[PDB]
Amino acid sequence: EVQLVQSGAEVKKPGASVKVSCKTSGYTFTNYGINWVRQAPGQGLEWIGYIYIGAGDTDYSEKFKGRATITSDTSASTVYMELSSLRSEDTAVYYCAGTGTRFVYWGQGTLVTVSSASTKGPSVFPLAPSSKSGTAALGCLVKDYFPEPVTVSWNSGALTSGVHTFPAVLQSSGLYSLSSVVTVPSSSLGTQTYICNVNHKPSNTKVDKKVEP
Amino acid sequence: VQLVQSGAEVKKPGASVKVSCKTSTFTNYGINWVRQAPGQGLEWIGYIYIGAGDTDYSEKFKGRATITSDTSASTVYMELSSLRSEDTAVYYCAGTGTRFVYWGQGTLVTVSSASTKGPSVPLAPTAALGCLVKDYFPEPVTVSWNSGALTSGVHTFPAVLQSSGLYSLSSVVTVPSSSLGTQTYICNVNHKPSNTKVDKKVE
């Protein structure tokens, strides 16, 4: 089977440079052109460049001027994309397309995160029901944490039904923010006590905030 | 040159959807059709070249998918038949052209047996406010605070589909605690598929 395996995810600081690799196993053809494309977290895709393995002809877009350099190793059948002088605006998943003119095969995508931060424990904020909440909703927002992940449980994992933890968003600052909400019968609110257990293993900090009005 | 794709679609299983890529013509271009499932990787449906005129398809979509080009002017279309839940992804058109490959914005095609529901939207305690959206079909929901006025400290997180078949969403804004009591905070949630806009005031 023909598959394209890209390199692992890398977190880089602004002004740094990242080189991503796409190897292609199962294709022993001398015609093996790879196309580079990046998708920003909310945006759609956009082209970076193209390289053909034997003749070695490379081509970049108007966006990247000299921060885009695609290279290839015929022996190891790996193609590499290097993006230099990174900015925070370069945070995206870089895919490699496959075989040639038609994008028949795709790589799993390598996520590159450009952030100026280093490591932060999150500040969790308890969100209790408002004056208009028979179901009521409870939250803890996990604000300002770098990098991921963060695991959030309610009542030490005792409470699972109705608990939804939404995907993290990297802010402009370079920090992740997250929210965890749980919908619970409102009758329970006075007697049942609820705590949002947030764990950020990268910083070794585990905060348990109790939610109540 | 820019490739402009058709609007987002919501269809029921077994239906057919035809997506289009208008361009700034596409003669001698080579348009590929690719779909991305949510959060997942990319998948190729087919390719059509105008001059060579060879249409190529993926064995996965060779029967259900058909790619065509407009007769007059220039426009490319992808129609996929016998829709399934599993076909829910963003369809992307990519035009090679002359030494640049231009991408379309992408079109979201949602395929669920599920039927349109408006959101059930308040969360109160610098403090942190936001209102959490409950089960709602389909997916485009737009949240703002104070009718676009409050855009500082507002973070609206991506939706999550449930076993229910419905999406739930979260919008949180962090505001100075001094303001509570003087500043009034209303979240405006607009779910256009339902023709519904809820304004829930939070304290």
Numbering used by the authors:
A (entry chain A): 1 to 133, 137 to 216
B (entry chain B): 2 to 25, 28 to 124, 126 to 129, 138 to 215
Task: Provide the publication's sentences verbatim.
Herein, we structurally and biophysically characterized unexpectedly occurring human heavy- chain only antibodies arising directly from transient CHO expression. We found these non- artefactual HC-only antibodies to be homodimeric in nature, with an extended interface joining both CH1 and VH domains, and to be linked by a conserved intermolecular disulfide bond similar to how Fabs are linked. Further, these HC-only molecules have similar or better accelerated storage stability characteristics and thermal stability compared to their mAb or Fab counterparts. Unlike mAbs or Fabs, these HC2 species are expressed efficiently, independent of the LC, where one HC domain seemingly mimics the LC during assembly.
To understand the structural basis of HC dimer formation and the nature of HC dimerization, crystallization studies were conducted for the Fd2 domain of molecule A (Fd2-A). Crystals obtained from a sparse matrix screen diffracted to 2.9 Å and the structure was solved by Molecular Replacement (See Table 5 for crystallographic statistics). The final model consists of six monomers of 215 residues each that form three homodimers of HC:HC in the asymmetric unit. In the crystal structure, the three molecules within the asymmetric unit are structurally similar but have distinct and different domain orientations. The final electron-density map allowed the positioning of most residues with confidence. In Figure 6B, the Fd2-A structure is shown in ribbon diagram and reveals a highly symmetrical homodimer. The CDR loops are also highlighted and face outward, similar to how CDR loops are positioned in Fabs/mAbs. The electron density corresponding to residues HC-216 to 224 is very weak, indicating that the loop is disordered. This disordered loop also includes Cys219, which is engaged in an intermolecular disulfide bond to itself in the opposing monomer based on previous studies of HC dimers and our disulfide mutagenesis experiments. Here in the case of molecules A and B, HC dimer formation occurs with or without the presence of LC, implying that perhaps one Fd domain mimics the LC, and can promote folding of another Fd domain presumably associated to BiP. Remarkably, as depicted in Figure 6D, the novel HC2 or Fd2 complex reported herein overlays nicely with a representative Fab structure with a low overall Cα RMSD of 1.10 Å, revealing that the opposing HC, or Fd, likely mimics the LC structurally during assembly and promotes complete folding and assembly of HC2s/Fd2s. Hydrogens bonds are apparent between the side chains of residues HC-CDR2-A-Asp-59 and HC-CDR3-B-Arg-102 (3.4 Å distance), as well as HC-CDR3-A-Arg-102 and HC-CDR2-B-Asp-59 (3.4 Å distance).
